[PDB]
Amino acid sequence: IVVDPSSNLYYRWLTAIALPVFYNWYLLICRACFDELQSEYLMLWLVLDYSADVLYVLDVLVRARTGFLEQGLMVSDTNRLWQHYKTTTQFKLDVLSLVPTDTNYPEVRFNRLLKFSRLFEFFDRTETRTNYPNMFRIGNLVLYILIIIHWNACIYFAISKFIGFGTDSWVYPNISIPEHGRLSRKYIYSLYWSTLTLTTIGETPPPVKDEEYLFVVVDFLVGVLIFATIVGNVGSMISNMNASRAEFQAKIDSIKQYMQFRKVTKDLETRVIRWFDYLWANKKTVDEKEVLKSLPDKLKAEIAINVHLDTLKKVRIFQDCEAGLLVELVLKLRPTVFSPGDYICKKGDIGKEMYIINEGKLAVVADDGVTQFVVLSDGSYFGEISILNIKGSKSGNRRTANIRSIGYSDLFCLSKDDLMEALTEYPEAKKALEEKGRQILMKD
Amino acid sequence: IVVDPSSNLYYRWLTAIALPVFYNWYLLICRACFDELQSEYLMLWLVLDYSADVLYVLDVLVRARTGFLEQGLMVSDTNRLWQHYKTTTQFKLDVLSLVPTDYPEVRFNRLLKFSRLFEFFDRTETRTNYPNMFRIGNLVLYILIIIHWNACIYFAISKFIGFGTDSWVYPNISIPEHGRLSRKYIYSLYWSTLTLTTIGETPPPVKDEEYLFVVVDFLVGVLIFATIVGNVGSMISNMNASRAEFQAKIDSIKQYMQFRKVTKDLETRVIRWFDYLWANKKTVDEKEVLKSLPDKLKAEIAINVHLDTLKKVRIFQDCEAGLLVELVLKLRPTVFSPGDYICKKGDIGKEMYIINEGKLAVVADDGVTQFVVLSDGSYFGEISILNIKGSKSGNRRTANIRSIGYSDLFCLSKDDLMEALTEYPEAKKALEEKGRQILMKDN
Amino acid sequence: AIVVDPSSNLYYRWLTAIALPVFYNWYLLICRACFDELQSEYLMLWLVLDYSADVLYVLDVLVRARTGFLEQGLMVSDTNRLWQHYKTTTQFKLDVLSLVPTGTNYPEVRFNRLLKFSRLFEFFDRTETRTNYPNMFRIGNLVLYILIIIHWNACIYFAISKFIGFGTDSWVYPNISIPEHGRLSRKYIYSLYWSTLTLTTIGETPPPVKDEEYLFVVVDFLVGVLIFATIVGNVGSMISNMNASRAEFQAKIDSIKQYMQFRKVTKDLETRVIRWFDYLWANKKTVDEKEVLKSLPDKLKAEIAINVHLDTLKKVRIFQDCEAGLLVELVLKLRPTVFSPGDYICKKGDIGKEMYIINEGKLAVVADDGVTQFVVLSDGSYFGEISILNIKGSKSGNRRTANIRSIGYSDLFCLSKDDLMEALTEYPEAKKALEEKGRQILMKD
Amino acid sequence: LPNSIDSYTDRLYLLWLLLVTLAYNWNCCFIPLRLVFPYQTADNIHYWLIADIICDIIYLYDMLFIQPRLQFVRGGDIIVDSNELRKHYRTSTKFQLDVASIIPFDICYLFFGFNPMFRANRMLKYTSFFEFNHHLESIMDKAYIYRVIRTTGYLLFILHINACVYYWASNYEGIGTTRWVYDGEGNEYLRCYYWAVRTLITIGGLPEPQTLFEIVFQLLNFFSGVFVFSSLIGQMRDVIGAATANQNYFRACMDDTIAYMNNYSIPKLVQKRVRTWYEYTWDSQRMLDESDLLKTLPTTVQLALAIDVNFSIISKVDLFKGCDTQMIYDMLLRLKSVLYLPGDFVCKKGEIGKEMYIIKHGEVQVLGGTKVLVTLKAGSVFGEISLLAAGGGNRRTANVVAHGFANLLTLDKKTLQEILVHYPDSERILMKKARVLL
Ligand SMILES: Nc1nc2c(ncn2[C@@H]2O[C@@H]3COP(=O)(O)O[C@H]3[C@H]2O)c(=O)[nH]1
Ligand SMILES: Nc1nc2c(ncn2[C@@H]2O[C@@H]3COP(=O)(O)O[C@H]3[C@H]2O)c(=O)[nH]1
Ligand SMILES: Nc1nc2c(ncn2[C@@H]2O[C@@H]3COP(=O)(O)O[C@H]3[C@H]2O)c(=O)[nH]1
Numbered sequence A: 001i002v003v004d005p006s007s008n009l010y011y012r013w014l015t016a017i018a019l020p021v022f023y024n025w026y027l028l029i030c031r032a033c034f035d036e037l038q039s040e041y042l043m044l045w046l047v048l049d050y051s052a053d054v055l056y057v058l059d060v061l062v063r064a065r066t067g068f069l070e071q072g073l074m075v076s077d078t079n080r081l082w083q084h085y086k087t088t089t090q091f092k093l094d095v096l097s098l099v100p101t102d103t104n105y106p107e108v109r110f111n112r113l114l115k116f117s118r119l120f121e122f123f124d125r126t127e128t129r130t131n132y133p134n135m136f137r138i139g140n141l142v143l144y145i146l147i148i149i150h151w152n153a154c155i156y157f158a159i160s161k162f163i164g165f166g167t168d169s170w171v172y173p174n175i176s177i178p179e180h181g182r183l184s185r186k187y188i189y190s191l192y193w194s195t196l197t198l199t200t201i202g203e204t205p206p207p208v209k210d211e212e213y214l215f216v217v218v219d220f221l222v223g224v225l226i227f228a229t230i231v232g233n234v235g236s237m238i239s240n241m242n243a244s245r246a247e248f249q250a251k252i253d254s255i256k257q258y259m260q261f262r263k264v265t266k267d268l269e270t271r272v273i274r275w276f277d278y279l280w281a282n283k284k285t286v287d288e289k290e291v292l293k294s295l296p297d298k299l300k301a302e303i304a305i306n307v308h309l310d311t312l313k314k315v316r317i318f319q320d321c322e323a324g325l326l327v328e329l330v331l332k333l334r335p336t337v338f339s340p341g342d343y344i345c346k347k348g349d350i351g352k353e354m355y356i357i358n359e360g361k362l363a364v365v366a367d368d369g370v371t372q373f374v375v376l377s378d379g380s381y382f383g384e385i386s387i388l389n390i391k392g393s394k395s396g397n398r399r400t401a402n403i404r405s406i407g408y409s410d411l412f413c414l415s416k417d418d419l420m421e422a423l424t425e426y427p428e429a430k431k432a433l434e435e436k437g438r439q440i441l442m443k444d
Numbered sequence B: 001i002v003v004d005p006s007s008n009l010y011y012r013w014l015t016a017i018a019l020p021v022f023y024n025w026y027l028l029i030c031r032a033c034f035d036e037l038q039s040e041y042l043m044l045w046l047v048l049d050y051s052a053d054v055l056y057v058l059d060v061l062v063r064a065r066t067g068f069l070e071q072g073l074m075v076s077d078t079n080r081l082w083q084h085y086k087t088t089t090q091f092k093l094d095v096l097s098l099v100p101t102d103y104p105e106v107r108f109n110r111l112l113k114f115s116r117l118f119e120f121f122d123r124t125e126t127r128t129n130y131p132n133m134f135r136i137g138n139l140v141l142y143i144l145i146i147i148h149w150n151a152c153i154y155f156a157i158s159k160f161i162g163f164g165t166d167s168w169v170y171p172n173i174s175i176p177e178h179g180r181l182s183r184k185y186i187y188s189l190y191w192s193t194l195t196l197t198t199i200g201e202t203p204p205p206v207k208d209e210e211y212l213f214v215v216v217d218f219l220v221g222v223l224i225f226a227t228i229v230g231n232v233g234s235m236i237s238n239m240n241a242s243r244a245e246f247q248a249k250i251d252s253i254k255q256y257m258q259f260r261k262v263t264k265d266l267e268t269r270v271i272r273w274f275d276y277l278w279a280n281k282k283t284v285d286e287k288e289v290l291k292s293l294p295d296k297l298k299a300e301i302a303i304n305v306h307l308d309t310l311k312k313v314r315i316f317q318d319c320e321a322g323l324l325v326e327l328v329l330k331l332r333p334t335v336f337s338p339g340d341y342i343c344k345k346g347d348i349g350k351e352m353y354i355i356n357e358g359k360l361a362v363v364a365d366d367g368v369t370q371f372v373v374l375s376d377g378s379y380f381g382e383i384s385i386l387n388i389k390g391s392k393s394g395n396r397r398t399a400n401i402r403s404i405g406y407s408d409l410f411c412l413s414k415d416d417l418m419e420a421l422t423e424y425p426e427a428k429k430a431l432e433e434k435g436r437q438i439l440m441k442d443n
Numbered sequence C: 001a002i003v004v005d006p007s008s009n010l011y012y013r014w015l016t017a018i019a020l021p022v023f024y025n026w027y028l029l030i031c032r033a034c035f036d037e038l039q040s041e042y043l044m045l046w047l048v049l050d051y052s053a054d055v056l057y058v059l060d061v062l063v064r065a066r067t068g069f070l071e072q073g074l075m076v077s078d079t080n081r082l083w084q085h086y087k088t089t090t091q092f093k094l095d096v097l098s099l100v101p102t103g104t105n106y107p108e109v110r111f112n113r114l115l116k117f118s119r120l121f122e123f124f125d126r127t128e129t130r131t132n133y134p135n136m137f138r139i140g141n142l143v144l145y146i147l148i149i150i151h152w153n154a155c156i157y158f159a160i161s162k163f164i165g166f167g168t169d170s171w172v173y174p175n176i177s178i179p180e181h182g183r184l185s186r187k188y189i190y191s192l193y194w195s196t197l198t199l200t201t202i203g204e205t206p207p208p209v210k211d212e213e214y215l216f217v218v219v220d221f222l223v224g225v226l227i228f229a230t231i232v233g234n235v236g237s238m239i240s241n242m243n244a245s246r247a248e249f250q251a252k253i254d255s256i257k258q259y260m261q262f263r264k265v266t267k268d269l270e271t272r273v274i275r276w277f278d279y280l281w282a283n284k285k286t287v288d289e290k291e292v293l294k295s296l297p298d299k300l301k302a303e304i305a306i307n308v309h310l311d312t313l314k315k316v317r318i319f320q321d322c323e324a325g326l327l328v329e330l331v332l333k334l335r336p337t338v339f340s341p342g343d344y345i346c347k348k349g350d351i352g353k354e355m356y357i358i359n360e361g362k363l364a365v366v367a368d369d370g371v372t373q374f375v376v377l378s379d380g381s382y383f384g385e386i387s388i389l390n391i392k393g394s395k396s397g398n399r400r401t402a403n404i405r406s407i408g409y410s411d412l413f414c415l416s417k418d419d420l421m422e423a424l425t426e427y428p429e430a431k432k433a434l435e436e437k438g439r440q441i442l443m444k445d
Numbered sequence D: 001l002p003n004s005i006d007s008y009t010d011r012l013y014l015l016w017l018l019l020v021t022l023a024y025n026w027n028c029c030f031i032p033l034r035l036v037f038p039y040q041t042a043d044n045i046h047y048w049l050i051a052d053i054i055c056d057i058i059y060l061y062d063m064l065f066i067q068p069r070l071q072f073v074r075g076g077d078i079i080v081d082s083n084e085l086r087k088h089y090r091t092s093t094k095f096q097l098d099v100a101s102i103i104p105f106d107i108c109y110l111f112f113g114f115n116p117m118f119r120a121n122r123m124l125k126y127t128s129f130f131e132f133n134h135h136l137e138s139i140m141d142k143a144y145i146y147r148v149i150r151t152t153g154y155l156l157f158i159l160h161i162n163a164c165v166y167y168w169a170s171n172y173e174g175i176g177t178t179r180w181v182y183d184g185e186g187n188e189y190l191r192c193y194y195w196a197v198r199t200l201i202t203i204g205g206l207p208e209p210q211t212l213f214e215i216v217f218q219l220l221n222f223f224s225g226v227f228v229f230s231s232l233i234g235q236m237r238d239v240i241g242a243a244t245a246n247q248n249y250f251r252a253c254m255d256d257t258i259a260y261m262n263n264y265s266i267p268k269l270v271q272k273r274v275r276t277w278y279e280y281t282w283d284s285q286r287m288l289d290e291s292d293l294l295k296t297l298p299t300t301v302q303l304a305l306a307i308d309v310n311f312s313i314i315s316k317v318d319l320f321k322g323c324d325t326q327m328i329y330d331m332l333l334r335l336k337s338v339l340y341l342p343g344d345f346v347c348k349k350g351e352i353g354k355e356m357y358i359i360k361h362g363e364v365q366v367l368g369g370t371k372v373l374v375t376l377k378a379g380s381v382f383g384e385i386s387l388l389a390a391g392g393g394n395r396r397t398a399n400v401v402a403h404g405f406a407n408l409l410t411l412d413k414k415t416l417q418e419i420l421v422h423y424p425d426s427e428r429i430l431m432k433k434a435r436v437l438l
């Protein structure tokens, strides 16, 4: 059996193996530095370390049987997979993170930290997988900040133990005292000093000896570099979060300043601002071409027939004229958004647009009298006789009605040439639509 | 009555209901932690809380009888609105926040109407005249709420630990200097600002829970400072983004003109044009600024910007409405520098110009003389664009045309003019008869 | 009878000569108001400088009553209409309010002279637009604004300290009777030190004691965290703008490298393209000229096209007898391409549809064999002017007659056959003139 | 030692700029240090002097034997000849700075004793430091790690300058006079670097200044420290935004199209197909669109990049032996890159056809209606007969689907016709090729 790297069994395995790598990092530097946590809960840490080593054995056994892409298809030959895992440095790392060195010195198990690529791959898969990527980036950086804070707390306690407890004013105090002697106080005051040094706050006791001066200089330099990276990345991510709305409001006040300068009257100004308010309120700010230019025509056609074919399939002779030509039409259609009371067409105008109504309600009104001839809900179509314009007709070359908007309608336009070069490969569809347009145009 | 969700009444209602939500947040955490406000101004807080609950029940009635868009139309069936409100989660949140739990910690369910305040802030951000000033006001309001909540949290932790047993906690409140409510609130706010703005001038912790609370508080303060820096950087880089883009454009133009070794009088001409542009605010260009609005809205905008100057010329009024719409959308505006010649003699007549905010004049061959000085509303470029055999001229000009001041024109090239005279050459022929009359008269 | 032109340089000289006394008025007026030893000790200097600042203020009123303004495209010059245009604004109201002529110990009554901030803002904006060091001036302007804020806060802290009483608390200024904390230099430098350590979130001040001091310090720390946020934002935007073009070019280089490592190109083509792009960067022409000149008007584009390409397109002897209309049309419709060494411009036997005008390059014609330098061309030369006229009757039939390779980093001008036909489809006499001159040169060859 | 230098090929001259960088960085670090600390003791002047002598010999070797050999361009053609290249170096502005920096004030040691302030003119080789920065940043395959190293180097150098200045101010106030100055009890450079870190990083915790010189010093140091820390945040943020730019844009478009599909309530199968398309596009190209990348490059480099990736695949086609190089080049400049998911159709048996499919890193199978007739590895081509024929032509004779992640190259019918109408003789011989095919 071969597991797929893009599957979900592999991701559940990534979670069940990115638990003990994180355990190894966090609690192994803590067990190696504090040394009462190790020699107190010895059976607990031995059970957890044996479980971590068995999970690493299964990690090597899974990476020696995972699949990879070669010439498009999933390669599943076991000998080729063994060789392809053997040739990479990750196999050397997974072998170096397995040698069973370990009692009272758990520093000998630091070779289990060499499998950091697994935790990084788990973080990367969850970032590209979950539906909250910015909050997961916040969580990833907060976990990195906490790991670095915990590691410098452990390093401050180790430097204090190596120099001598309670000797200077900078080191951890004398450990024989029962107030500074418990492990909770040990770890919590080491975390307090670690965060008040790595934050560059400095409400901590100043150093005395030269090795303490050197460690505190190096620690504030690491603190300012880490905190500069954190501030910069959080500012960049907040800017990425708000960029869309910022450029939208940029476009808004740009067109506002334009019309205010070019002296457009207040009713048209207020209608444009109301249209932009409606656009933001119903979330149609993105453009279809600008969002799906990159996707290929096959997937664009899948989304097109998922969105508009259910609305197009209810008109008369369009019951599967030809599948490829219906695909071409639902790809080459183009959206538009209208305002209430806006005339789609006047009298005495050339027609070059077929409009389909979809989530909208237009109306056919007379010229002088505001009247309701017939209302048209979604799925209806209009424009056909003026797009066709076949020889032998009345041949006005004009739109013979007033299709007026009732509310905030939303049509999906289709130009005459985007009809023509769509149907150019199959002229029998043109012949059928020509006869239907001819009969409605000649019976009037 | 059905409440319009986009009107002015709805926004004024969002103001009148995002006042007591902010009151409930701010003064409920303060009255829960401080225990002196709730003891002193008991009837005042009871009156204001009863008024906030009346505003909450009026809020759930107004969010009941408000409208929502269906098929592009605002529905008005009140039972349909009630069903649409009953099926969603905001009615669940409202009926959860209206549990009648009539010391001041039992009223913390009134904080659940936070989306109403959030909607008021977003509606004001959309609706106001000063979006960046409102963004910085909203950011100071958010960090003041956070500072106040952390001050009340520090005071509650100090009361739980004991007053003055340690040196980190608030002092012994029986001493009459540290026992007043004014100094209690101002010292808790000052401690909270010193912790959250990552400064740490405060006394250091002594107990283990104090060490842990100060670590959590400093990490919260790091993330608050990073969010403040990010939001002010985004605002200060989006407030002069137009200036930065125009500076990059000017620098690319300067780079090109320095590379191609063009002469210094043309250099000073281009830089005086760019200084005129930046001192008169014509920075954005037409084709890119009018691409993101719908087609009938830009047709309406073209109507409203050029009919007021196309109806000032009398001889051009005899034209059909559809031709007027298509030409008023196909008009292209350009801005000409002073002294620059629009059409010389012998040059092919390409374009038809409409004078709007400009003072052009005609001159002779390399001689500044004034045969007739044009003004606003006039028109020229008419006899070389219809492709007529004229008075032994053809497709050429008649005389030189200068530019006295920073004129602005309405260009119409022969291509879009054939796209004009593909619709009713009869009306264009009437215009051609009067143009040929002028032509035979003057040449 | 003079009219000050607000786009000239005399107006900028006046903006400098009025942006010195406004800035002085702001800075040293808040200092003289809050300290009350400068105002008592340097009284002759402050009276002289105040009288000079009010003289410059009234001359600024007189000048701003005589600056023209662009209506109908022209610069209007009649003094009555300029006075009316001045009087209908609110800036004249602010100026006549600032010029109010108010026991020579309180400059608190002279705070109306601060109301000419518009001159200082106009000077800063005109300098930012005009000078050639825009990022250095943006950082200088930010430093000046936060120095004004730090100075105003230092004067405010000293005024609050004088109101509370010197040496009463531990947060306020020390006792001024002790002659070490009593020098005026010591006073101002310690007040500036306190306001910088507060307003840039340093926090080394002594802790406050009373409620009013706690409230002033928390308000001052919130103003300080906002000032630190704007400082970090402005310096980040300055760093992101100082090399934005270079970062865009490195992004383009990395995109080309990623595309080439994707499509598995040969290493010689990869290093050729990389050295080509680095040469295009070092020669400062990597951006395409239509994207440069998109924002220019058509007349300025035409004048730039004349000034660039007519110097080379009048060096041609074959295309000489035509008209300035076609000259301007061809210099508008020339499009440039930059080449690489060893690149084939036009091989033998190709459909000639482009014409090339060499400009800052050096080329070569060779045979089908390879590197046999027959004729090395130079700047101002031309080729392609015989297979784009499409003359019937000769042995070629629009076919390339030579293998043309570049030996250095050439820079040509592609003039396409369709572009020339669009240029000449409204000139039949120029069409037949080019046809007959091509026929004569082809019967010569 | 060659006759001339290769500005972009010389590993030797890159190590030479590394040596001049080490000399110039030695001077920029250690001239403040020797100037303000008492480290030039009586048993150390000979060691410091042989260090400065080998520094100045590296300077003179750079001015004489290397810098008159670097190649350059003038008028497009590269320059090889030595006298003209040396004249180009002599009349350049680098020689101005170099002769201004090699001015030997070491002869002033006999007039005023030993003072390394006289060698402050050797700090003017910043142009040869920046050429080294630009060369290493251009040659390294990861520019962001070197940008971080250069930012940390600038930070450590500014802090060393501030430690040296603080110790000079401590001597000028007198060591151990007041409570602000350095008290002498430890390592001088270490405690002074500690002071410079906790001041110029704007950290706090140091003793309060007393004398007015100390207050002015501490004020200007904190203000320049706020600006240095702001420059550090801005520099690191720019490194982040320039290292993750295409990843952030790709993730932004991927999240905006999944937001579009969740706004239109798109089914889970179509959303999974779209997201596995995006995941394979990221694992293949590390980029979203490549046509938009190609439209920015110049025309002849577009043509060369197209030919080097597609000309063997065209010239191995037995049907395209008769056609000619110009329109083959144009049609290879006008191909489209597509990606078909496994299990999807590219041509149905009975579907009309208007495209030509070149396959490239893919594996498709032809089905004659589920049994696979043939398979095609990378480089093969199919779908020709329904490309060149006019009118309805012929429908596709069989179902062909992508087995794996096929990355086809498509040429549409009408685009081929638009290329063909510019080339009438080859269009005519292609019609005759159609007639001898049928
Ligand atoms: N005139 C007219 N058009 C109709 C009617 N019902 C549907 N339509 C469509 O409405 C149209 C709107 O203008 P068109 O010229 O585009 O063509 C018309 C028809 O295609 C009807 O009863 N009258
Ligand atoms: N010659 C001339 N043209 C005028 C006059 N008044 C308006 N115009 C227009 O100015 C023109 C400029 O060039 P045109 O060829 O466009 O044709 C000319 C006329 O249409 C006038 O008094 N003389
Ligand atoms: N074949 C050829 N072209 C030359 C010669 N001298 C100048 N030229 C020009 O070089 C050209 C380059 O290609 P063209 O087809 O454009 O036409 C050729 C001529 O106009 C020469 O000796 N032979």
Ligand SMILES: Nc1nc2c(ncn2[C@@H]2O[C@@H]3COP(=O)(O)O[C@H]3[C@H]2O)c(=O)[nH]1
Pocket (backbone or CB within 6 Å): D347, D353, D366, D368, D373, D374, D382, D383, D384, D385, D386, D395, D396, D397, D398, D400
């Ligand atoms: N029918 C068929 N087509 C094949 C086979 N091998 C390659 N092809 C190509 O596959 C094609 C797919 O549809 P086409 O009409 O384009 O024409 C067919 C052939 O050119 C095969 O065995 N059968």
Ligand SMILES: *[C@@H]1O[C@H](CO)[C@@H](O)[C@H](O)[C@H]1NC(C)=O
Pocket (backbone or CB within 6 Å): A165, A166, A167, A174, A175, A176, A177
């Ligand atoms: C620590 O405390 C013990 C007893 O409390 C004492 O004997 C020892 O000397 C102390 N050591 C230090 C270094 O303070």
Ligand SMILES: *[C@@H]1O[C@H](CO)[C@@H](O)[C@H](O)[C@H]1NC(C)=O
Pocket (backbone or CB within 6 Å): B162, B163, B164, B165, B172, B173, B174, B175
């Ligand atoms: C506070 O002070 C009062 C009297 O001053 C004393 O009775 C009380 O015990 C003190 N409380 C604490 C916690 O110290």
Ligand SMILES: *[C@@H]1O[C@H](CO)[C@@H](O)[C@H](O)[C@H]1NC(C)=O
Pocket (backbone or CB within 6 Å): C166, C167, C168, C175, C176, C177, C178
């Ligand atoms: C300041 O010094 C004078 C001089 O002795 C003294 O009288 C006064 O009380 C002092 N003020 C304070 C607040 O200590």
